[PDB]
Amino acid sequence: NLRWMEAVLPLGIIAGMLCVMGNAQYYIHKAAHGRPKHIGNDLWDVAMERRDKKLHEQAASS
Amino acid sequence: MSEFAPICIYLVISLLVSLILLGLPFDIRFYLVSILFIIFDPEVTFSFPWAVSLNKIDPFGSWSMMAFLLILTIGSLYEWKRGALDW
Amino acid sequence: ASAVDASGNPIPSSSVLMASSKHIGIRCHSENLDFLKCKKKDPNPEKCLDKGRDVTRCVLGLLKDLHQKCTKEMDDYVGCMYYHTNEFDLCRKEQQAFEKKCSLE
Amino acid sequence: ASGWGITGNKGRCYDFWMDFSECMSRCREPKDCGLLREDYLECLHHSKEFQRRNRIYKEEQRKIRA
Amino acid sequence: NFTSNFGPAAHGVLRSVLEMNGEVVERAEPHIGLLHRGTEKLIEYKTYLQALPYFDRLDYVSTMAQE
C-alpha cells in the first residue's frame, strides 16, 4: 500500500530541481574562484582577499 | 556592494528568457486604503532600523518606538471608529 | 593556500595570519601593543614605522618557529582555512589538532 | 559637523571642528583663531589640496611643450 | 447605476441583468426563455403513456417525483 506516493512524486520532482538549482551555482562558483562562496563579506574580508591574491601571485612569480 | 552586479545580470538574463518564452508561438474605498497603506508603510520603514539595533539602545529605544506606535495607533483607532476601513 | 613559499618563508597569506592570530596574541603582545600607542599619538605613517618593523619581525619569527614544530598539522590547518575562507566555526577539528602537537602557548 | 561618521567612528573631519570650537568659544578674542576655519572647511572640501595638485599637473604639462 | 450582465460550475443557462450601484444589486432581473421546448403543445399532440417521458424530462434532477 503506497497509493499516496503517486501524489508526492510530482511534488518530489520540485525538491530535486530546487536542490539541483542551488547546487548548480555553488559548484559553478567553486570552479570560478577555487573555493566556495562566503556569506557576509565585510570590507575587511574583501581587502584581505585582494591582499592575499597579490601576495600569492608575487610568491608564484618571484 | 558588488552583489547588485549579479542582481542586474540576473535582471537582464531574465528579460532575455522572458522574451524568448514570449516569442515562441509566433472609489473612496480604494483611495482610503491606499492612504492607510502610505501611512503604515513608513511604519515598517521606521521599524526596520529599530529592529536591528535593540542592543546598543537600552529601554529608551523601546519606549521611544512604543510612543511612536501609540501615536499611530490612536490614528488607527480614529480611522476605525470613523468606519473608513469598513468596505 | 600553501603557506610555505617553496622555501622557509612563511608567506603571511592572511588565512595563515588568522590561523596564527589564535596564537600570536601571546608572543609579541606587549611589544605589539606599543605599536598601537604610536598610532594613537599621531597617525603619521612616517613617525610610526620603527615599531611596525619591529612587530613584523617578531611575527615572522613566530611564524618560522611555529611552522617547523607543527608542520604537517599546520599545513592541513591552513589547508582548512583558505577553504571556508575564514570561518573558524568550520572544521574546528583541525584546530583541535593544532593544539595537541603544536605549541599550545 | 557632528561626530557621527557614516560608519560608526569619529567623522573624518571632526578633530578639526573640535579644535575650532574650543578655540572660538574658549578665547573669545576677536577672530585670533579664524585660522582654523580655513583648515576645517578645507577638510570638508579639500579645496586647497585639489588646487595644489591641479597646479602641479598644470606645470608638468606646460613643461611638455618644450 | 451600472447595467451589468450575467451569462454564466454549470449551474444552468440563465441570463441575469443587474441594475447595479457600486457593489449593490439595486435590481436583478432574469431572462429565462433561453431553454424552451413546447412541452405542453407536445403532450397535447401526444397522449398519456406516450407523454409520461415528458414529465420525466421536466426538472431533470429529481427524475421520478414528476412521474
Added chain:
Amino acid sequence: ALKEEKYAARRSILPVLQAEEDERFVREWHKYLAYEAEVMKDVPGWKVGESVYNSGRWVPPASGELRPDIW
C-alpha cells in the same frame, strides 16, 4: 560568543597588516614626492614637502571619487 572569537582574532592580527600597508603607503608617497620635486625645480621653491594643511594632524591625501573603498 562566536562572533566575539572572530573579532578578537581579527583585532590581534591587525597590527601586522597595518604596518605592512603603512610601509606600502610610505613607499608610494615617497615616489610621488620625488616626482613632484623633479617637476618643480626651477619654479620658485615652495617647501617641496608642502603640508598644505597647517597645524600638524597629518590628514591622509584623500583623493576625489567619493566612497573609494567600496567599489
Added chain:
Amino acid sequence: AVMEKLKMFVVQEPVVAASCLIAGFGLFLPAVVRPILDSYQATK
C-alpha cells in the same frame, strides 16, 4: 455591570481583545519587570 459589559465586548470582538491583551503583556513586561531584574542582579 462593567464586568458584564466587558464580557459582552470580549465575546463580540475576540481578536481585538486578544491583540490588546498581547500588547498589554508586551508593555507590562519591561515597565515593571526590568527594575526588579536589575535589583536582583545587583543583589546577586
Added chain:
Amino acid sequence: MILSVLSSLALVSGLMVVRAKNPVHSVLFFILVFCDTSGLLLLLGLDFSAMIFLVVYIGAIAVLFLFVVMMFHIQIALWWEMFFILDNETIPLLPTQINTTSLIYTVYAGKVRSWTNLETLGNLLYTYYFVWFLVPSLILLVAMIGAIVLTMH
C-alpha cells in the same frame, strides 16, 4: 559610465513627466524617474535608502498616484552653467586622479567590525534625536485624519 546612464535616464524621464501628455504616461515616467534615482543612490554606496526609495517612494506613493489618475482617465480637460562650474579649477583634473589612484591609505582598524548604514542609522535616530522622530509621527497622523475629514462623507 553606468552613473552617466542613470543620470541621463532620470533627466529625460523627468522631462517627459513635465511635458508628455496622457497623464498616465506622466505617472509612468515618474515611476521611472524614481527607479533610476534609487539605482543611483545604490551606486553612491547607500543601500538602505535605495531599498526605501523603492518601497515608499515607488511602491507606496506612486501606486496612490496611479490609482487616482486611473479613476479619472477621461479627465483630460544649462550648458553655460555647466561650463561655469566645470571651469573652476577646484575639481581634480582626471589625469591627477590616475597616479594618486594608487595612493589611498586604508586603515584596517576602523573596519575590524563594520556598521551597515541601516544599523548606524538606527542607533543615531532612536537613541538621540528622538523628538525628530516623534514629530513625523504627528505629521503622518495629520495626513491620515486629513484624508478622512476631507474625502470621507
Added chain:
Amino acid sequence: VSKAAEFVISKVDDLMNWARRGSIWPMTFGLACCAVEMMHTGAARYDLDRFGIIFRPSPRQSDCMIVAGTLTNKMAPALRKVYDQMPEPRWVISMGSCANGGGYYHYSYSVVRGCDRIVPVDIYVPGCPPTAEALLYGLLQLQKKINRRKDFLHWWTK
C-alpha cells in the same frame, strides 16, 4: 521523398498529435440534463482529469466544445457567437440526443433540430442521457480522430 525526411515528418506529426490529444481542453455548454451526466463524467467515478482534460470556462483558450443538452431558437446566436471566439484547432462533441438531430422536441417549434445546423459538429454521441461511459468513450473517439491528424506532412507537401 527523401525517405529519411518522410520518417522525420511522421515522427513530428506523431509528437504534435500526441500533445494535442493528451492536453485537450473542452468547453462545456450545459443546456439540459446531459450537463448533469457530463458532471458525473467529470466526477470521481469516470474521472476526466485523468485523461488530461480541464473544463476551461473562458472560450478564448479552449479546444473542444461539448454541446450537452438541447438547443433553442433563442439560444442559437449565443452558441454561434461562443463558437466563433475559439482559436483555430477546434472540435465539437454533441452530447445527448437533441443536441444532435433534434431528438424528442425535434417535433416542436422553438427548437433547433440538432446543433449540426449551427456549428459543424465533429463527433456526436448517442444517449438519453448518454451513460458517463458513453460520453467518455466519445471523447476517446475524439482522441482517435485527432490521432490521425498528419499535419506537418500536409504543410511540407503544400
Added chain:
Amino acid sequence: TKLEDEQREQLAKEISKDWSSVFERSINTLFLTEMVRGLMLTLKYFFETKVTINYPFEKGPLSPRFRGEH
C-alpha cells in the same frame, strides 16, 4: 431595526454567562479548531483509497434491464 439591537444584547448576555465560557469561545475562534478538524478529515480522505474506475480497461456496473443500441 430597533429589535435587532435588543436581540443582539440578549444573545450576548446569554452565551457570556461565566468566564470559562467566554474564554473557551474566544480561543476557539482564535486558534481555528474547526479549520483544523476540516483539514484532518481532508487529509484522511487523501490517504484513503480512491474510486477512479479507470474506464478503458474496467468498465462500470450495469443491469440486464439496460437500454442501448437496438
Added chain:
Amino acid sequence: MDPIKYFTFSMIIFILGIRGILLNRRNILIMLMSIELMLLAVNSNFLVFSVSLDDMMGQSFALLVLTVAAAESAIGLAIFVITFRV
C-alpha cells in the same frame, strides 16, 4: 568630479520640477508630481552631502523629509480628488 555630477543632477531635477509647477498651471496632477520631484531632488542632494562630508545628520534629515513628502502627496491628492467630484 563625482560630487559635481551628483549635485548638478540634483539641481537640474529641481529646476525641472519648478519649471513644471510654474509653466503648467491647470493640471493639478502634473503640479503635485512636480512638487514630488522637487522634494526628491532635495532628498538626493541631502544624501550626496551626507556621504561627501563624512557626517550622518544628512540621512536622518533625508528620512524625515521622506515622511514629509509622503504626507504632502497624500493630503494634496485628497484635495484634488475632492475638487474633481462636482
Added chain:
Amino acid sequence: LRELKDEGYLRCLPDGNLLQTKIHNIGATLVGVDKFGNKYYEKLGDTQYGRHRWVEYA
C-alpha cells in the same frame, strides 16, 4: 526479457493506463482469454466493488 518487454510491457511508460493495469495484474488472477487474443482478469477479494473484473486488450 526484451521480447515481452517490447510486446506488452514498455508501452506503459508513455501510455499510463497500462501501468495501472500491470499493477492490477501483479495483484490479479486469470479467468479468460478471447479469440481477439485479449485476457480477462478478476482480482476478487478485499479490493473493492467497482474494480475487480477487467481486461487487457492484447
Added chain:
Amino acid sequence: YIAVPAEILGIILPLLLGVAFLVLAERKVMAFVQRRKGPDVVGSFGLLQPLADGLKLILKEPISPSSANFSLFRMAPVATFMLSLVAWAVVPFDYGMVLSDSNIGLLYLFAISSLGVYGIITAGWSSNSKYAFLGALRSAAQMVSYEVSIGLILITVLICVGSCNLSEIVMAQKQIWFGIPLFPVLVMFFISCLAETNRAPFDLPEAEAESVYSSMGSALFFLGEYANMILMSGLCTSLSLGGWLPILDLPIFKRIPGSIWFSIKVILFLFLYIWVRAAFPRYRYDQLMGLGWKVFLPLSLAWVVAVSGVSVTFPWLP
C-alpha cells in the same frame, strides 16, 4: 565574467521545470484529496502532462490583442515575470549556496513584492474592457494590505535576530526554529502569504473575472503567479522553519546534504498550500479586506510589541 550568466541560467531554468511540475502536482494532490486520481494517462504517472500542455499551448493558433498592441500590452506580463524571478535571486539553498549575499535581503523581498503589485495593476489596465480594470484595482488593494501585514511579521522575525541577510537568519534558527516559539506568527504569516497571491480562500477577484487574453500572455501570467507562490513558500521556510538545518541535531542527519532539507520544507509548504485550497469556501471581497484591515494588522502589531518586550527584559537579545 562568464560564471555569472551560467549561475543565472541554472537558477532560471530549474525554476520553470519545478513550477510546471508544481501545477501538475497541484492537480494530482487535490484530486487525491477529493477521492479521485489526477492526470494519469499521458505520462507513466502523469509525468508527461505538463510537457503536453506546454506543447499544446505552443502549437495553439495565437490571437494578438487589440489594445495598446506594443510596449504596454506585450510588456506587463514580462514585467511581473522579471519581478518574480529577480526576487528569486537572493534565497539561500545551503551554506553559501546563494547567488548574491545582498546584506539587506528582507527589504529587498518586500520591495519586490510591491513591484509585483505594479505588475498586476498595469497588466489589468492595459486591456480594453473596464471590468478587468475594476478587478485589477480589487486585487491591488488586497495585495497591498496583506503586504503591510507581511511587513510587520518580517519586523518580528528581524527583531529576534540582529542582521538581515538570510544566511544569518538561518543560523539564528540553527539554534532553535523560530516557528516553534512564534507559532501564531507563523500562522499569520502563512495566511498573509495565501492572501498575497490570492490562492486558497481569497479568490473573489479572479472568481469574478471568471464570472464577469493572449494564449502565451495568460501562460506567462499564470507562470508568474505560481512562481511567486513558490517564492513565498521558500522565504516562509527560510525565515520561520530553519532553512537547511537537520532536526534534533544528531550525527546521522548530518549525512543528508542540507540542501535536501530546504527542498523538503518547501515541498511540505507547497503541499499545505494545495491542501488548504481544497478544503474551504471562498471569502467575499468585503470580508476579505475587512479581515485584512481589522484582524491581521492589529494582531501582527501586537506580536511585534510582545516579542520586543519579552526579548528586551532579559539579556536574550543579540
